[PDB]
């Protein structure tokens, strides 16, 4: 997005900035919650092979 | 499978059996009467389909149960898959004890000790209590021992404390993806309903005590105890198997405490004076001198192991603070004094622990890490650790930089609307300008916050 | 029932030392087969093996 | 949610009498006798058959009749005391001998039970 | 002025800079207004039960001329009330009685009616009724149904770009999903083929639907393709040229246009040449013969002289054929453009692939597609193709979907029929071809304007239809057999299918589950949750990465910051504070109409689509008093993006800052000062709280707490109430004013408070009155406070003095240090409530009765039991104690003198009854609060049931007789007033009424008639009272239905108190997620210069990484509010005048900003100020909105006013050494919450127990103690240690090897400590399971 966020948490954030950061937070949470199955499958394969 | 009352439907495993049995009976009955060819062929085809569904269902037909659309499990469905027999049989056996208690933190425990509740340490060690009661003659029979345990007499707790004294117990967190997941410790009789964990070992367990539980297992045979004491203690897994660097490094509190303990502002109280070494701890408590004091000369004796076979002592005058001397008081003789001078950062503590382990051994570096955790939990709590909204300093030039960036973006979009710049650039240039503005703002913030 | 699922004389025995008939019980007969009931007098734990 | 609905193996006053046998110290021969004795125990709590019956069912003429008595004299102080009693009366004798002699009329009650139950029947 | 009574007791200061223009809605209209129209009688058959009745209204027999009509339906009053269904255990529903009309037509006569049977109505099932709060009483439990967010029916053009084909191929497809029926797809192919896919089945030749619809090849070539021009005269090969039709194609040579050449041959085509050719007139121009091979014939032609099969349709032109067709007799041959630069045919290539061309050979393929065998006999294929999605029997597709489909094709007509025609599919395929060639853009699946939400009403109507069609067929199949009969229509109607369907829908469903009772904020959120899993929409949580993601359209429709932390994050959503639902089914959001730069007070609800074409401004913008914008450049959204625009292009503005946040996260103070994910997980953690003994209002809030507590319905709101006359711990009465009640009523309102009732979450609920005596309550005010409520404001947690400092490491990363004063004051102490039920379980061996005379147990355990078998209320029970004495009789015995001895000696035992008592589980210490017992009709075993029966009878009779006494007093006053000036002294009526002496000599003209009328009214009132009492007593002991095999059920409730202890998950509303480690005593805790110690100690290491400056701001604001409260308490204790206190309060309330105007002495009468100040003396409540909270300068000003430091830090001393702490730490109060994760249930311990029948392995749960899951990741760790013996003893002598674990136990008891490997039972089970098949495995040696 062209317009970045220029408001820290000490001076408060506006509505558009928080709404935009909500997307990145949701993406990060989904990635951290869905990478565990891939890590477990990789460990399963590495143990079963060696 | 009695579900509710006289429910003897025997579903998902015997329905196919009775179906095949009745199909075979009807086929035999029809063959005994010389039935027509088409009818017996259809009956044999139905029997073949039933046998195929019984041996391995899901490949053809997908025979469902009359109850709901739930596909019943055949003789092969209970073998393969995540719900198969090879999951429970192979590395799926449940244990009796299994722990399952809430884990907490404890600052008074040792690296090779763990706190277990008295109620949990009584149900698990029940056969041991029965054996001790039968040996000491307090319980003439097994029934008497059970009755004494169920009543929780006074001598029962003393016998439990006598028995659980030297019996190791291996505790592990449920999510484990390495070797340091399972480690053994020594039980400690503590009240409450929470298993106390050592603060330094948390890095190995990757726990923050935000609500996670802990599993506990008690070995029985002597060889299991030997394997837990000589191969599964925290005092043996100090280094990481994946790297070799010390994984027992302290947490945020101890590092912050050790960092704040060795500082000096400009010329704080107790500056410029000369004194002894370990004696400097008296001026701290007696308010005669602050722990932060530069240009302070102290007498430091260094036991260097440069000579092959034995170490030699060296006495000289050094320039240091009071906190560094107080830290050196607990520092072993083998380690030099130049290691506690560089403000003792996070990387510095790990390097010091590694050098101590590689030069002086395992027990010395373990005791030194324990003393480090102690003095950290003490000084971080006592001296300077705090937080406030006034601590966040905002640079004054931030508004000017934002206004300049906005003016630059306005000029860029004006040039774009004029027809000299395309959309592709009218975008990349704005991104670059905002990145430069953010970098500038970060610099101006670090200029006013760091060493200002 | 007779000659069915969970039946006697097949698929395993019944209560350790008591025939389904009611004769040759009380550990007085180890491995005999009665004429009224063809149920062995073995332990019930062997029912998971036949 | 597999083959077995849940599946649970209830204990019962037969398995509970067997549990105790293991813990207690007997020899290899005394162990067999005891196994045989507890087989004879019923839901009510009484050795079903007889004393000499167990001796005759063990097929070995050697083993004395007191041999079983010796074992059977210790199995009936197990969990519920008075288990495996001998004809709804030795129960009282075993149950009474158990608690202390400081009870008020233990003498009297012992004397009653010993030979004077027929009279109490009326 | 607030002009409120419940608010004047404690006024919360607000800092909202922007005024509110729209009040907070009921917040429960999504569940209340949806079920209303489904049960409300509507005149027109639009929706509800009328739409379901009219859908299957025509019921005609098979050539029988019989029809069944209806007039209307009606619902009767429920048998039981709302509380009676929860006590007994029956569902709360109303019977559906509908009138019918059976009119049979006389055969052999056109429309001959002989008689009608429209004189008896029929009952069709019991329909559940929703309460006023939005829950049901299904099976005596409170259940909630969640609305389903699913893609709206219609046509959607998907992109399908990426690795779908691994070649950079964007296969554009078109799918249509009706509400009911079969689906239809138009998936693409890398070979440029529009393969058809019906119900995700096998592929299709892509043109079967075209040939099955009577469309021939020539019709397809004429419709989907256009023939521009073709002419041949004396082998000239002259054809017209249109520049607009075809252009941009390079020509080889021979390019002349009637003499002068416009486009030079052999050169690249340019726009100038096209313009010059279009400017001049164009005629038939000659073309080379090489272009004939490239063209394709569209329509087949034949010679007029010979009817040969030459010149087939859809075939490339051949040279040898050409020389023949030129003399065949056809001068004009239809051709195609085939300009691949702009137009892609994609049809002519697919026509030759189809092996079938006839209509019959095409309609048999669709039947062979669905059926593998059974070839159609010229009647099965056509019937299957017509009944699939053309018969309207099962193709009614939610005509809202028809409107959505017409909107996609730019059709102006939105009203149409459910079934579509050939033109619809033709237009869909044409639009797909245009999108493939390039036109417009594809649709968005994640767009809210493309997906709808089905509430409880739509699902209930769907269910009811599915249950009623079963009846249609039934009645239809019954009217065919035995038509010559004059019986009533009762035999044909059978409500069993309808009842079974509605039961299966309401009782147990995937989207209908129990609701949490604790922290009624959770109740409100659950009543507003929206799920995706279930029938339709998404199948599992792992459907896709982009589906469960935040969308820009989620601005004012759903709540993005509120989502479960579980693996199903993104699928569960929460409605906003101002979100609504369209009549079609989509979502809406309100905006303020802005015209010519000024803002109008009118509001308009725009949907997701309507909000995309207009410009909408933001709420946090400057605005003048007259409505003009202060700054010319305003930030606003034009199309999905926020940019700067002028004050004229703006069309709408937001309503408030609370529009983009739901009520679950809006209560979070300083939401903008916290991290996105932190506040996200904190909003969810808010719903996991538990009430305590005393509720304490938050010193800092948002103001929405009042509305939440009001709309939650857990409190006791007042309706049409006036002056209060009597209050009690469980009963309140209110006397309504004379100008409010309607005539013919006494004018009293009763309120029964819920006292210690078991909740669905094993917790307690309780209500207490807020008024004392003689206080007037207006309409809409609160009367009592339920759980976690204080003075009408939601009070979940408590305000505790917090600090941010390490203390000997007892405040680690996520641990919290708690003082001892917290335990002494019983803070955060909760009460749990459990229930134990026992049934008689009648069997073959006679019945079972409770007599409290069970043998094998002394009088010690029976001392707490009553003469019937239950224990007395109030008695304490610790561990396994006998609560209900139940016996099970055994089979009879013979004479058996041996056993008859003990039978006659010991009384009446004789092995007749067992000891099957209640026998509660292992050690639990608690008390009994109340019991419950049910008994079927026809049983007189009520030994003590009459006690609770008489108690309920007296409880009802009290409130019944209150109104009777009020009416009798009114009638007596009327009698005393009618005898005035009639010659009656005051001493006569005072001593005894005596029926006014029967009006002996009062007036002798009208007094007699007055006395007669008064006596008649008194007799009528007495009769009504007697009838009401009789009906109430009959309804109380009417009886409850029980299980067939169960004779009577007895339930006993237990209540336990649980306090704080190490291991409790205490966390605030900012994401603290901390636990308890150790309780520090009083003197050990640090203190200030005044000697006041802190109660809560946190970790200061959390704030830097976990960005939660909001919690620190809340702490500073709470410190300021407590400073103000301490000053007020000092001014109250030092006994100052009322004027000084009033001045101080007005000054503290009127400074900070221009947010509002509030001044005392205007409404208060110098007496309300004292009671108002006596409530906020422990702290001053402060309200801060979501995105318009208070600034740091205001906090500093309030701190300076409350005689507190500006920064917030203060010097503290050590409670162990007494030394001053350098670097002063911030001090202040904070609102802490207690979660439901105590160690009282998480703790588990077992050494031995019961094992399963298969493989002899323990269980996994807590009840019936079982071991935990020893996964592969634990043993794999042990392999890296080399502990072979440890793994062996862990896997052999702990779970399997029944003899091995017994030998291990024996050796541990004896002290041998020896083990054996034996053999695992699971391995033998696996061998036995494998040997069942044709696999031979054995153990050799």
UniProtKB/TrEMBL annotation, chain D:
It comes from the Bacteria. GO terms for cellular component: DNA-directed RNA polymerase complex; protein-DNA complex. Signal peptide: none annotated. The keyword Coiled coil does not apply. Belongs to the sigma-54 factor family. Sigma factors are initiation factors that promote the attachment of RNA polymerase to specific initiation sites and are then released. This is RNA polymerase sigma-54 factor. The lineage of its organism: Bacteria, Pseudomonadati, Pseudomonadota, Gammaproteobacteria, Enterobacterales. The chain holds residues 108 to 229 of 477 of the full protein.
